[PDB]
Every structure is written in structure tokens, then in C-alpha cells.
């Protein structure tokens, strides 16, 4: 790192439009649908990990887990291969092509060293980064069971075949589900559409769904955009959009310099906002009574203040955390 690039990142932090310019850079084709990829930008930051070993709770993850759903090919074809070539800490793997125990750290015979040594996988090497994995709607049954402690307990405890080993690998994992008919059914609620159990969908933070309305005016703002950039070569990409060399250097500085934390005024809004989101009803009923969404709400406030380059969290970033969670409710209802 040099001083010829850190000063340019500090001048953009004071601008109130840095959060909107960086969110639109991840959409090189689709004009709308910005709320889907809006939460992905905050996934790379996550938040500063804290320690509480003096109270009996040492391990604690501050990473954000985003949940997606839609047609694997319509609008999710570019959101699964673009976060792999730019981010160096990305590991791509297949769900159905790989085994359940083969993805993590399993046990395999080795007569060369005369000892049952362990083997690596894919998500166990991308620590403090981002993992890439597709096909979550038709994944293996045995693979869904081992995910109850990886992204939840942050401790892969595998004690079988006389092998006592507890891995401490943790990595934010994203998913892209799909309905039973790849289309939203207004005749049924959103609970029956998702085939995943209640214990699986509750571990995710936000939730979105790729909707294709049949409105006539909807195509006037989407079909007129892809054709405009279809015949144009490379005479406008580096003119109206910033390069990718700044995004890779913007996240490699705040992850080891700015450690934000909660205060006494901005933390009082998390209690009042938690009670209002409990008595929802109508759709499912009196749900959301777990410390899961309360813990995920704190991670959203730490990620918004990390992009602003400020350790002090005010009441402005708290109002922006609940706004992203409010849009996720109207999307799945």
C-alpha cells in the first residue's frame, strides 16, 4: 500500500453518494433489481469480530449471510461467477457434483504415512473471505444436515471413526433457492413455496425473490436498456463507470484499521425496532421471537458504518439497517 491511494478513499467517504455509486457497479447489464445485489456489497465487510471469553462466549462471527431465490439463469447467472474472479478469497464449488463430507474436512486412508490423516476441501480454505456455492434447492439431503453447525456454531466438530478433530473454519456462505415451479404463486403463501424446513431458512438474514411482473410498462425500463448496450463495444464502460481497481483496494483497508463499535444512543433503536417486527401476523403469524434476527440486525449496523470509515456509530446508520430488512418483508409477501 502507498499514500497515493489511501487519500483518495478518504475523500469519497465524506461524499453522501459513495453508497449509491458502489452499489450500481455490480449491475453491468440489469438496470433495475438493485435491492437484490444491495446486500451483497455489505457481505464482504461483515464487521469487526469481538471477543467475550471472560463471560463464557468466546467465538462469535460478525459476517452477514444473504439468502437469494429465483430462476438459476434469468438474473442469477452473473451473481455467481463475478464475485469469484475479482475477490481473491473466493472458492467456487459444486453442490451435486461434490459429496457431502468431501466439501469440508473428511477422513481418508493413507498407507504412505501410516496414519489416518485429514484432507482439505473448498470452504475450509477461504477463511475470513467469501465462499461460492450454487444449487441449494436440489442439493443432497446429507449436505443440508452438516450445515447446522458450520455457519451457526463456527466449529466443525467431526468425531467419527476414531478421529477426534474439531475444525474452527468459518466463512459467509450465500444461497440461491428456487420455488417448486420457478414462479411465484399468489394462491399460496411464501412458506409453502420454499421447500426448506423452518430451521434452515431461519438461519439466514435477509430474503429476496426474483419477481417477473406481467406489467406492460415494466418492459419499457428493462428491454430498452440491454439493447442500448448491445451494439456498443468498449467505448463507454471506462467513461461512465469507475474501474475495478478501486473496489479491491477499498475493502483491503477498513478490515484492519477501523474497528467500529456500538454506543449508548444508536443502540437504543435496536430494542424498539425488534418489538415492532415481532407481531407481524397475517402472513405466518406471531413469529420472529428468536435472538437470530436481533443478532443479524447488529451486523447490518456495523457494516454500514465500516463503509463510511468511522468507528463511531450514530443514529443515521441504524435507520439504514432496518430499511434493508423492511424491503425483504415486502418482497416475500
Amino acid at each position: 500500500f502507498s499514500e497515493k491511494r489511501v487519500e483518495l478513499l478518504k475523500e469519497l467517504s465524506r461524499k453522501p453518494d459513495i453508497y449509491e455509486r458502489l452499489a450500481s457497479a455490480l449491475a453491468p447489464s440489469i438496470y433495475e433489481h438493485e435491492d437484490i445485489k444491495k446486500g451483497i456489497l455489505l457481505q464482504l465487510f461483515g464487521g469487526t469480530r469481538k471477543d467475550f471469553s471472560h463471560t463464557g462466549r468466546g467465538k462469535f462471527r460478525a459476517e452477514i449471510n444473504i439468502l437469494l431465490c429465483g430462476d438459476p439463469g434469468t438474473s442469477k447467472s452473473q451473481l455467481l461467477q463475478y464475485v469469484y474472479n475479482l475477490v481473491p478469497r473466493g472458492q467456487y464449488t459444486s453442490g451435486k457434483g461434490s459429496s457431502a463430507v468431501g466439501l469440508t474436512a473428511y477422513v481418508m486412508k493413507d498407507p504412505e504415512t501410516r496414519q489416518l490423516v485429514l484432507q482439505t476441501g473448498a470452504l475450509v480454505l477461504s477463511d475470513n473471505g467469501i465462499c461460492c456455492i450454487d444449487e441449494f434447492d436440489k442439493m443432497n439431503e446429507s449436505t443440508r444436515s452438516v450445515l447446522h453447525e458450520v455457519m451457526e456454531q463456527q466449529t466443525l466438530s467431526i468425531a467419527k471413526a476414531g478421529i477426534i478433530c474439531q475444525l474452527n473454519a468459518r466463512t459467509s456462505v450465500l444461497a440461491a433457492a428456487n420455488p417448486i415451479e420457478s414462479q411465484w404463486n399468489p394462491k399460496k403463501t411464501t412458506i409453502e413455496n420454499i421447500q426448506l424446513p423452518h430451521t434452515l431458512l431461519s438461519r439466514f438474514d435477509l430474503i429476496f425473490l426474483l419477481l417477473d411482473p406481467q406489467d406492460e410498462a415494466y418492459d419499457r425500463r428493462l428491454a430498452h436498456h440491454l439493447v442500448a448496450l448491445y451494439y456498443q463495444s468498449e467505448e463507454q464502460a471506462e467513461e461512465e463507470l469507475l474501474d475495478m481497481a478501486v473496489l479491491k483496494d477499498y475493502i483491503a483497508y477498513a478490515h484492519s484499521t477501523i474497528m467500529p463499535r456500538l454506543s449508548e444512543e444508536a443502540s437504543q433503536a435496536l430494542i424498539e425496532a425488534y418489538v415492532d417486527m415481532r407481531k407481524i401476523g397475517s402472513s405466518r403469524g406471531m413469529v420472529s421471537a428468536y435472538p437470530r434476527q436481533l443478532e443479524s440486525l447488529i451486523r447490518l449496523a456495523e457494516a454500514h458504518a465500516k463503509v463510511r470509515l468511522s468507528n463511531k456509530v450514530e443514529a443515521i446508520d441504524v435507520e439504514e439497517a432496518k430499511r434493508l430488512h423492511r424491503e425483504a418483508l415486502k418482497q416475500s409477501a
Binding site: 434469468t74 428491454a223 440491454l226
Partner: protein, 119 residues
Amino acid sequence: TSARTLLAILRLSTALARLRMVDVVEKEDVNEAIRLMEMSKDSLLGDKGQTARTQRPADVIFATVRELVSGGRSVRFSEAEQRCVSRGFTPAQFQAALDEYEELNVWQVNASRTRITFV
């Protein structure tokens, strides 16, 4: 029809522009591209989607009078002809078309046929 078929239309635009040894596209490469699409979707069924319309010599005449009913009631007979002769409607067929609807009780005229008012 979703976003998967949107990019397929632009793909067929270059299949015909490269056959004439040119680097531009014309209207011929667009009409012929959608011609194979309409023929393929009709072959997936058991019939062909067509239409039926009879060129009535008094169908567009009643639609022209509708432009004056929504604006006023006492429409002048000489003023209503200021828009019929613009496109190219013959005035001889208008005299024989008034009795086709006045007989079926639609509007009414006077003795001199100079006052028309929508009832």
C-alpha cells in the same frame, strides 16, 4: 416470455447482417428474424393463429362522430365533415350511412338534415 428470450432476439440480428458482406443492419434482417419465431411457435400447437376482419364501408364513420360527442352535444352537421374529408372519405357514402343507424334508433336529424344530436 421472460428475460431469457430477450437476449435471443438480439442474437438473431447478426445472423442475416453478415450474409450481405456488410457491417450494418437494415429492416430486412429484423422482419425475417421474427418470421422464423412466429412459425416455430405456431408449429407447437395443432392450428395456425390467424385473424378475421370484414372491411365495413361504415365502420370508421361511426368512430369519427364519437370525437364530437364527448366534446359537445349540439354537433353541427357541417362542422362534423371537417374531419371526415381529411383522410379521404367520400361524401356520397356518408348520406347512405346515416339511414343505416337512424333506422335502428341511434341518433335523429331534422327536416333539412342539418342538426345532429346524440340521444
